[PDB]
Amino acid sequence: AKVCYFTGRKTSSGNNRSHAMNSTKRTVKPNLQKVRVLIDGKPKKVWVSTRALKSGKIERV
Amino acid sequence: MFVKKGDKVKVITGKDKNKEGVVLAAFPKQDKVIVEGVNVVKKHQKPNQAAPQGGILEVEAPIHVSNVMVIDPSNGEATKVAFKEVDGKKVRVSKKTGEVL
RNA sequence: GGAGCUGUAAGUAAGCUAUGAUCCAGAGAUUUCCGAAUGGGGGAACCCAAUAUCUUUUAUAGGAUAUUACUUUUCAGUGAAUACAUAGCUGAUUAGAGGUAGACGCAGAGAACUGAAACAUCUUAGUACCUGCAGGAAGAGAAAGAAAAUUCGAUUCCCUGAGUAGCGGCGAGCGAAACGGGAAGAGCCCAAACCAACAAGCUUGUUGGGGUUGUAGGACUCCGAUAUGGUAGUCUGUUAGUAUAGUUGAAGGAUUUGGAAAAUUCCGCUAAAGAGGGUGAAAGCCCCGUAGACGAAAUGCUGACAACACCUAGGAGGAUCCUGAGUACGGCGGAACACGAGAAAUUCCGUCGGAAUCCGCGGGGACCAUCCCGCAAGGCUAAAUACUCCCUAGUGACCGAUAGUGAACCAGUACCGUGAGGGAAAGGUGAAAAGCACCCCGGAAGGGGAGUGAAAUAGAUCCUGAAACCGUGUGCCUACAA
RNA sequence: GGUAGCGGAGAAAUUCCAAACGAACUUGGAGAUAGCUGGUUCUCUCCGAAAUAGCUUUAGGGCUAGCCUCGGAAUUGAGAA
RNA sequence: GGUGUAGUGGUAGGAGAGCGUUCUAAGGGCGUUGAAGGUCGAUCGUGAGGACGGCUGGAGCGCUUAGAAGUGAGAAUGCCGGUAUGAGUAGCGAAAGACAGGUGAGAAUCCUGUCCACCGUAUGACUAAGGUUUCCUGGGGAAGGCUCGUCCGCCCAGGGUUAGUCGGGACCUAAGCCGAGGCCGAUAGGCGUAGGCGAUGGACAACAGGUUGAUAUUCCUGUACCAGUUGUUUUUGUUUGA
RNA sequence: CUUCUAGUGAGAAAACAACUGCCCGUACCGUAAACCGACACAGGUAGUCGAGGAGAGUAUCCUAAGGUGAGCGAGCGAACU
RNA sequence: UGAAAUUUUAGUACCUGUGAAGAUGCAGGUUACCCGCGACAGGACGGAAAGACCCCAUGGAGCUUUACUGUAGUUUGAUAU
Ligand SMILES: [K+]
Ligand SMILES: [K+]
Ligand SMILES: [K+]
Ligand SMILES: [K+]
Ligand SMILES: [K+]
Ligand SMILES: [K+]
Ligand SMILES: [K+]
Ligand SMILES: [K+]
Ligand SMILES: [K+]
Ligand SMILES: [K+]
Ligand SMILES: [K+]
Ligand SMILES: [K+]
Ligand SMILES: [K+]
Ligand SMILES: [K+]
Ligand SMILES: [K+]
Ligand SMILES: [K+]
Ligand SMILES: [K+]
Ligand SMILES: [K+]
Ligand SMILES: [K+]
Ligand SMILES: [K+]
Ligand SMILES: [K+]
Ligand SMILES: [K+]
Ligand SMILES: [K+]
Ligand SMILES: [K+]
Ligand SMILES: [K+]
Ligand SMILES: [K+]
Ligand SMILES: [K+]
Ligand SMILES: [K+]
Ligand SMILES: [K+]
Ligand SMILES: [K+]
Ligand SMILES: [K+]
Ligand SMILES: [K+]
Ligand SMILES: [K+]
Ligand SMILES: [Mg+2]
Ligand SMILES: [Mg+2]
Ligand SMILES: [Mg+2]
Ligand SMILES: [Mg+2]
Ligand SMILES: [Mg+2]
Ligand SMILES: [Mg+2]
Ligand SMILES: [Mg+2]
Ligand SMILES: [Mg+2]
Ligand SMILES: [Mg+2]
Ligand SMILES: [Mg+2]
Ligand SMILES: [Mg+2]
Ligand SMILES: [Mg+2]
Ligand SMILES: [Mg+2]
Ligand SMILES: [Mg+2]
Ligand SMILES: [Mg+2]
Ligand SMILES: [Mg+2]
Ligand SMILES: [Mg+2]
Ligand SMILES: [Mg+2]
Ligand SMILES: [Mg+2]
Ligand SMILES: [Mg+2]
Ligand SMILES: [Mg+2]
Ligand SMILES: [Mg+2]
Ligand SMILES: [Mg+2]
Ligand SMILES: [Mg+2]
Ligand SMILES: [Mg+2]
Ligand SMILES: [Mg+2]
Ligand SMILES: [Mg+2]
Ligand SMILES: [Mg+2]
Ligand SMILES: [Mg+2]
Ligand SMILES: [Mg+2]
Ligand SMILES: [Mg+2]
Ligand SMILES: [Mg+2]
Ligand SMILES: [Mg+2]
Ligand SMILES: [Mg+2]
Ligand SMILES: [Mg+2]
Ligand SMILES: [Mg+2]
Ligand SMILES: [Mg+2]
Ligand SMILES: [Mg+2]
Ligand SMILES: [Mg+2]
Ligand SMILES: [Mg+2]
Ligand SMILES: [Mg+2]
Ligand SMILES: [Mg+2]
Ligand SMILES: [Mg+2]
Ligand SMILES: [Mg+2]
Ligand SMILES: [Mg+2]
Ligand SMILES: [Mg+2]
């Protein structure tokens, strides 16, 4: 699915709150990016969140 | 059943009370028994049973097992039956005399 | 277990059974086809294959057996663009799929009617529904806690706090927690520092040791002990008990009514058994039972015992090192906390920014100082708790055939609908079929006799047999009345 | 054979979507809500109204008061004619 | 308890006291010498209601005190069942039948015969779907048939569908559908490549006659064709190789 | 299906004789009393054949092959429809 | 052979009047022997359908828009990649 390959961040549901506090359901998605990374020594394109990449600990082959 | 085919029994209840006879047949599932010359019924038969008259046949009908008592063969009296193992064999015993069967 | 048995289910027919049948319990064998269905296909219960062995035929055709899905794990070989490689492909190996119990648990997603006497915040409600994952329970759980009586010492659940404190178009409503009393109780592992080995490329990964914490702990350095205890382990036995068949189990005869005695009457007897059911009416003593005693080849379950297994060290020093980072936390936007952004802590999600590290860090409801309490960003953990599709044994001032399950009866049937789906009606002869032989009218049906039966106006539409409704007979009245 | 209800399809009529379509059918939320209509089963004894005021998104609803009933307390007896 | 005085219509509604139903407890009873229930009666009480007889019935049931309620029906266009009224009424669903003979308990209605009449681009003959035994033979007349019925597409008992060539499969594909990997996506899943499935189309070897009560390009007779196996014979090729 | 080579190849071809050839459907109704309409229902139901005279004709009338006489009737011969 | 709608029980007249104001059923009077059959449709405010017109309910639904509050989309900026 569309899930961060390393941290598991995934789409969830939230609320839209108007000034009158009317509530309607919305979807809140993580900032995923397709990235070519070395998994088990073989490069692959997987979904990765910008937060995971932030530390720089994620390979960027 | 505490009574068995071929036993001599005494009828203790029913129209034939105090009669005695041999057990012609036993029906454990129904808990009933047939005693010769006991509880005779007249049955209006068609001639369809190899009887070229139909006629009104006489036959003993079963009676409930609890309405009979086994005849103590040695004494000839009706008795209740206990169970004692004799010579490694489980057998019936007359509570009135201790006789077997 | 010990005499009948071949279900319902009669009837024939043919048989089995003391060489122990039928029947009951344990274990095992077989178990067509469809179905996750998996060799391929398919409109389920059907069709068509490949490989290898076997089989029929002189031979083809035919038949049987085994293997042949997909993905995941590990391994091996092959092997592109491309040189090495990798990918792909082949094989072997590994464990998943699906169904449930219309229950219980956790999670993702998540209404509306309704209430507010309208309605949008709010309420219904994180409910119904859907989906995922489960386990016999789940979830939680070993304090960056509760507190400030001075103290308590994991979690869960019950009572109480209390309809309180609070939240709330401050409306309608929503609504705690701690303390206190109980049920039950249990605590443990890593990461890191550091050490030894291994391998490559003085560090850097693998392995083993090491170590696990807040009255700070640990490494490290000195000392001294190589014990002491424990466990939530094991298809390890041995043993006991228990579940799944069973055996035994006391004591009544007469008299009256009756078709039939258990009822009546007269004398008895038994009781560790006077629970209950059946038997021709109401039985302590007729039967099945009950009290009580006894019983297991086989297979589970539990408990013990042992074995194996796994954990289990004290003291003194701090010079130095370690103690969980894109984490905690902050801005923005949501959400959970009884708490609807509010003065708003605490918890969580998305996004962006982004620490300290023992002189350290978090919390005590904005925030700061002091004080107190604790040590996050890693994991596991029984019991008390929730539920019952099922199995066993019982209970009921629960129903008694329009009731009680929709279904007491061949019911989720008949029937209805394209389908999802909706969904009935229908129990009672008699003690025993003894279910009316024979005769008579009639083509039969159906009757009248004759019989069975205590009773046939109990005759199978069969207990009782109300009312509506229909008809026969007639005591009185009725054809000048509104 | 395909398109399915927050929809489809429509040479367009709110027209068709399994004999009723301004939003199919079935099951569930669900015993929706109904200030509205209907119904609510034995007897006797004692007493016995109201159809008014005020306010109301209130007017055939409701709340307090007025009028009825049952029990109680007390009084310098306060009521009626 | 007696006397006296006063009072006693009543909807909404308040209060009080009772009747009856089922069940529980206790006590005390009744029942095949007939319980409950049903039915009839000219019976008792102030009311709900309570007795007692006769008959029916055939096995359970009162009474007293207390207790608990699925505790009382006449109305809800209430639900279910039964039966009425309308009423011996509407209707008996497009059209021609007549008679003789037969069968039989029974005939307008069944069979046979004769004449008559109707359809005849059909009301005839084949087939696909659909139905699923309704087909044939022998019985039956309960129910079904809008009458009747001796008869039936009904009931009962037996029996009937024969393929190398026909249609389908072991052949092909269209639309559409499924879909290894793959893409996408809160979950579920959506989409789709390879590859498959899928006729209404393409491809494909047999016809004539006869036979049964019921099958026929299926059985039989005659005469064929298509794919293949074995074998005999005949030719020709064996690795410059058909 | 026909060709082409690539590959494959020690057997091929012809005639003749004998022999082999699996599964599923096959009954019956089918402009209907057997299918869709709750009915033995004046409705609906794809395709093929579908004759003669007159006729352009499958129109029309009467007929052939063939099928059928319609599952309540007997009287009477009023109103009214 | 054999239904159905309807139906509180009916021994079911006329006039004038009365009455919830339009009577087969009430009052006064009048007329009328009992039971049917074939016809007609004035009445039973006849049957069928809890009026669709009208009004009401702090009912419902579909629709409109510069009604209120939201929102899918579309677009613009900041920020991450
Ligand atoms: K399958
Ligand atoms: K359950
Ligand atoms: K709402
Ligand atoms: K309201
Ligand atoms: K757990
Ligand atoms: K409370
Ligand atoms: K309010
Ligand atoms: K250790
Ligand atoms: K007995
Ligand atoms: K007994
Ligand atoms: K055992
Ligand atoms: K907050
Ligand atoms: K705190
Ligand atoms: K603390
Ligand atoms: K009887
Ligand atoms: K009479
Ligand atoms: K149209
Ligand atoms: K009586
Ligand atoms: K009623
Ligand atoms: K009727
Ligand atoms: K009638
Ligand atoms: K016949
Ligand atoms: K074929
Ligand atoms: K075809
Ligand atoms: K055939
Ligand atoms: K011509
Ligand atoms: K013609
Ligand atoms: K006829
Ligand atoms: K006439
Ligand atoms: K006329
Ligand atoms: K009126
Ligand atoms: K009229
Ligand atoms: K509407
Ligand atoms: Mg044995
Ligand atoms: Mg398969
Ligand atoms: Mg509201
Ligand atoms: Mg399990
Ligand atoms: Mg005994
Ligand atoms: Mg006695
Ligand atoms: Mg909240
Ligand atoms: Mg944040
Ligand atoms: Mg904080
Ligand atoms: Mg401390
Ligand atoms: Mg637990
Ligand atoms: Mg029932
Ligand atoms: Mg009954
Ligand atoms: Mg029912
Ligand atoms: Mg009688
Ligand atoms: Mg009867
Ligand atoms: Mg006169
Ligand atoms: Mg007179
Ligand atoms: Mg319009
Ligand atoms: Mg329609
Ligand atoms: Mg609700
Ligand atoms: Mg009064
Ligand atoms: Mg008075
Ligand atoms: Mg009773
Ligand atoms: Mg009741
Ligand atoms: Mg009634
Ligand atoms: Mg009439
Ligand atoms: Mg007709
Ligand atoms: Mg014509
Ligand atoms: Mg026939
Ligand atoms: Mg026949
Ligand atoms: Mg008939
Ligand atoms: Mg073919
Ligand atoms: Mg697909
Ligand atoms: Mg896939
Ligand atoms: Mg062909
Ligand atoms: Mg035929
Ligand atoms: Mg045929
Ligand atoms: Mg027809
Ligand atoms: Mg003609
Ligand atoms: Mg008037
Ligand atoms: Mg008048
Ligand atoms: Mg009168
Ligand atoms: Mg009237
Ligand atoms: Mg009317
Ligand atoms: Mg109305």
From Swiss-Prot, chain A:
Organism listed in the record: Enterococcus faecalis (strain ATCC 700802 / V583)
Disulfide-bond pairs as recorded: none
InterPro entries: Bacterial_rp_bL28 (IPR050096), Ribosomal_bL28 (IPR026569), Ribosomal_bL28/bL31-like_sf (IPR034704), Ribosomal_bL28_bact-type (IPR001383), Ribosomal_bL28_sf (IPR037147)
GO molecular function: structural constituent of ribosome
Biased composition (Polar residues): 9-25
Name of the protein described by the UniProt record: Large ribosomal subunit protein bL28
Family the entry assigns: Belongs to the bacterial ribosomal protein bL28 family.
Pfam families assigned to the protein according to its UniProt record, in alphabetical order: Ribosomal_L28
Residue ranges, annotated region (Disordered): 1-27
Spans through the membrane: none
Gene name linked to the record: rpmB
An annotated GO BP: translation
Keywords: Ribonucleoprotein, Ribosomal protein
Cellular component terms per the entry's GO annotation: ribonucleoprotein complex; ribosome
Keyword Membrane listed: no
Domain of life of the native organism: Bacteria
From Swiss-Prot, chain B:
Domain of life: Bacteria
Database matches in PROSITE patterns: RIBOSOMAL_L24
Keyword Ribonucleoprotein: yes
Keywords (A to Z) from UniProt: Ribonucleoprotein, Ribosomal protein, RNA-binding, rRNA-binding
Transmembrane segments: none
InterPro entries attached to this UniProt entry: KOW, Rib_uL2_dom2, Ribosomal_uL24, Ribosomal_uL24_CS, Ribosomal_uL24_KOW, Translation_prot_SH3-like_sf
Assembly and binders: Part of the 50S ribosomal subunit.
Family membership: Belongs to the universal ribosomal protein uL24 family.
Name the UniProt record assigns to this protein: Large ribosomal subunit protein uL24
